[PDB]
Amino acid sequence: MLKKKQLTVLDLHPGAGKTRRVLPEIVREAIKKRLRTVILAPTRVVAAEMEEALRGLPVRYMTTAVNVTHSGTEIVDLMCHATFTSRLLQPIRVPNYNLNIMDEAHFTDPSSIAARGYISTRVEMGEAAAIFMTATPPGTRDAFPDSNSPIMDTEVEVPERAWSSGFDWVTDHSGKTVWFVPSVRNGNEIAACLTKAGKRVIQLSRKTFETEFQKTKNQEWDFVITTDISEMGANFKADRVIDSRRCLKPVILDGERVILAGPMPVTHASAAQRRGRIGRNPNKPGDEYMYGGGCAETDEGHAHWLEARMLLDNIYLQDGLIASLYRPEADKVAAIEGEFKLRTEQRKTFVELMKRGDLPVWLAYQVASAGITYTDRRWCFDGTTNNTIMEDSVPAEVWTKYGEKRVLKPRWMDARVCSDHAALKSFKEFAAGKR
Numbered sequence: 001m002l003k004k005k006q007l008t009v010l011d012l013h014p015g016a017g018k019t020r021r022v023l024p025e026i027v028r029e030a031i032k033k034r035l036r037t038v039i040l041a042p043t044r045v046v047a048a049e050m051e052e053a054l055r056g057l058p059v060r061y062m063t064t065a066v067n068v069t070h071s072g073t074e075i076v077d078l079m080c081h082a083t084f085t086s087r088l089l090q091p092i093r094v095p096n097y098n099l100n101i102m103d104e105a106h107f108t109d110p111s112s113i114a115a116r117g118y119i120s121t122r123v124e125m126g127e128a129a130a131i132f133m134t135a136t137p138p139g140t141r142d143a144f145p146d147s148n149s150p151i152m153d154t155e156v157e158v159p160e161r162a163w164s165s166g167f168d169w170v171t172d173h174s175g176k177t178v179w180f181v182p183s184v185r186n187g188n189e190i191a192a193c194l195t196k197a198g199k200r201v202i203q204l205s206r207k208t209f210e211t212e213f214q215k216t217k218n219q220e221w222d223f224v225i226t227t228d229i230s231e232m233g234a235n236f237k238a239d240r241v242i243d244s245r246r247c248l249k250p251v252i253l254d255g256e257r258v259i260l261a262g263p264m265p266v267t268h269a270s271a272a273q274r275r276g277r278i279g280r281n282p283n284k285p286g287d288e289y290m291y292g293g294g295c296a297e298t299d300e301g302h303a304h305w306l307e308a309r310m311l312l313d314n315i316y317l318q319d320g321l322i323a324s325l326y327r328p329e330a331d332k333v334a335a336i337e338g339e340f341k342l343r344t345e346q347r348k349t350f351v352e353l354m355k356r357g358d359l360p361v362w363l364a365y366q367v368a369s370a371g372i373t374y375t376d377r378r379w380c381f382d383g384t385t386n387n388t389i390m391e392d393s394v395p396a397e398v399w400t401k402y403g404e405k406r407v408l409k410p411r412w413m414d415a416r417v418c419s420d421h422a423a424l425k426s427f428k429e430f431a432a433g434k435r
């Protein structure tokens, strides 16, 4: 594995021990061989779990998720996928790591795809080694991989709205359920229905994950209602998964707007990871996987792969050379390598609109490539009427930085800025000049 020019896919089944057994063996070998190593965790929760598995090994934790006094002699760095890609885009020197280890390497957020493209390009150049750890590599067609213990797989109609009748099996259960929903708003309605039926419900999504995930350890619960973020190494002491088998697909329409299409079927990889939350205890056979639809390759034409190209076009590799997407995920949506490469000041604007602005990649790119500076928010108000953002069926309004009350009507409409109440609140603060 550890030889220059090798990319290894470590594709042991979910719960096989990639994170807690194999990763420390890899790191000890890497240290013996004096390999400057990076370990990429998908989330702060996984970063903290890795610290427990690696405790006693000299690892530099480049995350506030871990409170450790570093020796300053570590040659192994650990950070999140997003942090790696962020530091590559910033005017900060990222070491040319000899060994690049990506845990939960199926993650399809743009920064994870971009990190795989950068790393796989360095390996192809003959510069580095890489290990991608995941039960479900890109293009897997198996939604039912092996598990530590037998799983009961059942195809069943799964509610996606509040219900009064016809789904007794949902609430008759006396254990712990992880339920994958396609969106925060859909989980909100299911969670309210379960809470009314007397259940204890925890909701997880990207923006809430570190904080809310701790509740799954610190309090008794009957249901976790989660988006797809729990596919990325989230472990639960559960005995059932309920899987809508649905997700939202961001889609760029006519190069000019992003919609959240669907809900529509998950990929096989997503279905396998959702299912893979259970069957993990070799002493507890018969965990249940209830699934409410089929799989499809909904990663084709999905905006994240075009967003990953926007990121990689703006990462220095060598002269004007541009890192390719990792080959198995490289031909999922039309892109021309280099088409999104920005001149120095526009690139800085692009980076800040993502880092400080918290805007989606695609929307950051539209603003930066238009020659708009980071603090110029006039574009948030000068779009067509059909780009009016709505709040409870009325046009959303903010006070501009000038003190003027204006309707929020962005020049470029990206549905992710108002996917839920928290997103809309954040975008209103942005439009107002508050960050």
Ligand SMILES: CNC1(C(N)=O)CCCC1
Pocket: 330, 331, 332, 333, 334, 335, 336, 337
């Ligand atoms: C730059 N990548 C390609 C794409 N996704 O359009 C070019 C055709 C093959 C893959």
